[PDB]
Symmetry: D2
Subunit: 212 residues, 4 copies
């Protein structure tokens, strides 16, 4: 529908220390906009940069034009799942999965997040990240499913950027029409939060296009 709800629970760990986060949100799938509120349930206060979590906190919330087949909106009411590996340049690596289902007008996410090898004096473990830059995801078919790798970067507390390469596999629960090679522009932003990020308001604007 034009206004949809979001409910999620993320269970995960970073450098072996476990945590859990829950969120409620709402979004406009055809306008490619969404927002949500999250609150650390376990493992707080988080000792790592919250920004590594945010892109894990749904490509149905993307404005697709009529000329590009919409893989994600097709998959419902059954839904879809995805897996993702996020490779940071300093060796830190996060693996994540999300199983997305639909209950009425509410998407339900079951999330697992696992990051390892983040250096003690790195920007993640020292909370020196500021914000994800906006980005352009490249989506393409392989083995009958959809993949979407990206060239991400976090702006840092004194300038400069901290790069991370995202690799994702999108799997529909049913048979859907596979799209052609296309792109999705992203802009994810934390609009507000408390001191230790126990509470976080997160927004994302995502839009598909066919390149130049």
């Amino acid at each position: 529908k034009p206004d949809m709800k979001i409910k999620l629970r993320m269970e995960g760990a970073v450098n072996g220390h476990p945590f859990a986060i829950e969120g409620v949100g709402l979004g406009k799938p055809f306008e490619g906009k969404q927002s949500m509120d999250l609150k650390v349930k376990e493992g707080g206060p988080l000792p790592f940069a919250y920004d590594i979590l945010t892109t894990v906190f749904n490509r149905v919330f993307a404005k697709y034009p009529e000329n590009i087949v919409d893989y994600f909106k097709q998959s419902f009411p059954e839904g879809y799942s995805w897996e993702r590996s996020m490779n940071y340049e300093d060796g830190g690596i996060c693996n994540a999965t999300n199983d997305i289902t639909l209950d009425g007008d509410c998407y339900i996410y079951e999330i697992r997040f696992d990051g390892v090898n983040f250096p003690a004096n790195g920007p993640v473990m020292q909370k020196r990240t500021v914000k994800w830059e906006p980005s352009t995801e490249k989506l393409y078919v392989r083995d009958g499913v959809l993949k979407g790798d990206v060239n991400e970067a976090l702006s840092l507390e004194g300038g400069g950027h901290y790069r991370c390469d995202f690799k994702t596999t999108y799997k529909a629960k049913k048979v859907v029409q596979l799209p052609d090679y296309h792109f999705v522009d992203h802009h994810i932003e934390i609009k507000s939060h408390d001191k230790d990020y126990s509470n976080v308001n997160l927004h994302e604007h995502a839009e598909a296009h066919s390149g130049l």
Copy 2:
């Protein structure tokens, strides 16, 4: 000027077998469009997919809006150089350099290209590539200079895509104002070629933008 000239020479090797290519072209830097005709002088007929070369055959040919500092157009008349690593997903990797100078209204490229570890049954050696797909390049400043990364993909013959990780370092020959984080959309196309790619007409269209607001 609104219309610029282009002359180039690439000397290189792929899997240890040397080759050399020269080209002539022209473009409109403020429109971000260019075209050129390339001829292989040595090492022909090339035993690898010509497409691995095309992105090596100049970001001055990109339409920059006023809201984004133009590092490349600033760097002239002195010019600039760039270094690039091209890591394909099956282990083949090409490293390339280009020293760009200006003589009147003509850009001069001196290009080196060396690719290795392309598997014999891979799409490059078997020449099963069709086209580069359009791409979006991410530019950011690091330690005083400018970088550019692209996650590119080659369209293949039987369907599917063959990905390549681009990583480029841009160095102006003079000090210029460094730009903020931004993007450049690309679309490179071989519009015409002869059978063994001894002659190639190559086009590229490029535009910088700041991404979604």
Copy 3:
């Protein structure tokens, strides 16, 4: 630490989003660098992936260290140590694992988490086309006061050939210990026996530290 030590572990994890859980008990000789264990699948069975991606997660205390190489791991006890590991396979599949090692009398206790993603449906892992890990030589070096370990490891495949994986591990002692110099550890891990569905597995590994070509 004694010539004969005990092991039991529990691993909880998921591969391509399919969760599973495994428990094991074992024994070994830390000063001889040999060990063996029996593992049982408790949840997520029958496992739909190659069991071989799990085995290197199922302890560098079981490595024969010569006197001239500082033993980072044997020093860390009785308090113990932990490690994190990223295993980067050449076809894009990636596994992250952690192990928190404690000591109870003569028994090592492992708390293990394992998470692998992006394994293609037709790749050797999901199709269980792996045979065994080849022997390997680990390279260990200090960075930021802790110990690192990288190996170029390869799985032999079921009709000839090898399937590569990049191991990169951070070792973290829970107390202050003396840091070693750059050194090596030779490995050979082998599944000695198992039932048809890999619900039961008997796993062994031998390891020996050295300092390269003398």
Copy 4:
């Protein structure tokens, strides 16, 4: 024969700076020892750490036991070639090739070396490297080809280590027997050099093994 000599010329560039080096050397292939003296012919004084070149300056100089097929000694008198990518952890990447022939008792190398994207503040451009650590190479057959991977590391003058991933493809000029998965221990050492490394005396010891028995 137990005593062989070496003569080589390497032509290359690092970050777009071309250079050339020639060397003469000697070794005992059946014991896995060799040494050579290298002289910089062009591009001196080299502005990068000489350590990036040495593993490019022949696995015929490795002691192979009887129970492991020797791909390299089988490859002569015709010889063999190899291609290699060396991926440093800070993004620096070098591509190298070597075409190895035999003239009487002298191995002749034709070497190309191309390194890109080394940061100006990194240990290579700053020249803060000490030596390569010993290493163990893993070799295996793929696609009728012999492959070689090493996780290398450079010791730095402050204790730390600067890792590099080695990927090499070995190709005999004739069809020869292929070995099973095995290992080669390495220890490469610069035993002497002048201040700006215009003269370098390089040694390497290597011995193949099957791993932990």
